[PDB]
Amino acid sequence: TTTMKISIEFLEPFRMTKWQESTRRNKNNKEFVRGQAFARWHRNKKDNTKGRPYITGTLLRSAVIRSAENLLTLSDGKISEKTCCPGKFDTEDKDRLLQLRQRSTLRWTDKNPCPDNAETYCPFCELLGRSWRFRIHFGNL
């Protein structure tokens, strides 16, 4: 593996969620689900407010995927000599997912997604990580 160091610089005041107990970090808690787009507070020890803020790599990943959809829309799906399929955003075990996509997905081709047992995946499916094992892993900030 090869490591890419990154940093994020804010130009405006950013929003942060209120810390919650582990019994409440699930889809049936409206307060937790509403805060999932903000920064988080980490308590060093659960019975004390002492802590520090952080940002999950999952959120950055989601923002990057949205950006990739827009860029591929502008290029008509071309990236170098390769062309991207529509990606796949369809899961049978829904209840695994804490959040589900409500917005529509941007479209650039009629072609079907890459097969689930393929060896070769187009760049968008590599970015989706569809190719304990990661191909592109986002750490926390």
Partner: protein, 152 residues
């Protein structure tokens, strides 16, 4: 808190390859005193309080600017938006514009303390102050200048 919908159906939408970004820069200048309300729960002495930065500059917040833009767009089109939080994005003419808009949060160079105004209510029957109706208010002066940047 808005509740997202887990039975929402999936859609693919083209939007096309034509895509432009317009940038507008300027200033917003206070022609009257102004009041962006925000109470510090640990400050009891003043009843109505103004929003400030931690270093006591006046703040024109992004949330208010977006809210006013959405209000004035509905005033232009002359049709209120009825949509509730959650579910697939609303397709009315105002929401589609607001989904392209971006605005900077802004603050002032001016950082002097606010004015304090007295305020009261008169009992109409007796012509004298009503029971409990004495209160005070922070106010931001006229003449403050804010940077303004909008993108679409």
């Amino acid at each position: 808190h808005g509740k997202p919908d887990r039975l929402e159906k999936s859609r693919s939408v083209s939007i096309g390859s034509v895509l432009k970004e317009t940038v507008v820069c300027g200033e917003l200048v206070a022609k009257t005193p102004f009041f962006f309300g925000a109470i510090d729960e640990d400050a009891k002495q003043t009843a109505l309080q103004v929003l400030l930065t931690p270093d006591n500059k006046y703040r024109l917040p992004r949330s208010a600017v977006r809210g006013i833009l959405r209000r004035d767009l509905q005033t232009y089109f002359d049709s209120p938006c009825n949509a509730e939080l959650g579910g697939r994005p609303c397709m009315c003419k105002t929401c589609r514009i607001m989904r392209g808009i971006t605005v900077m949060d802004a603050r002032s160079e001016y950082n002097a303390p606010p004015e304090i105004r007295h305020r009261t209510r008169i009992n109409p029957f007796t012509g004298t102050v009503a029971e409990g109706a004495l209160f005070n208010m922070e106010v931001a002066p006229e003449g403050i200048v804010f940077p303004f940047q909008l993108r679409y």
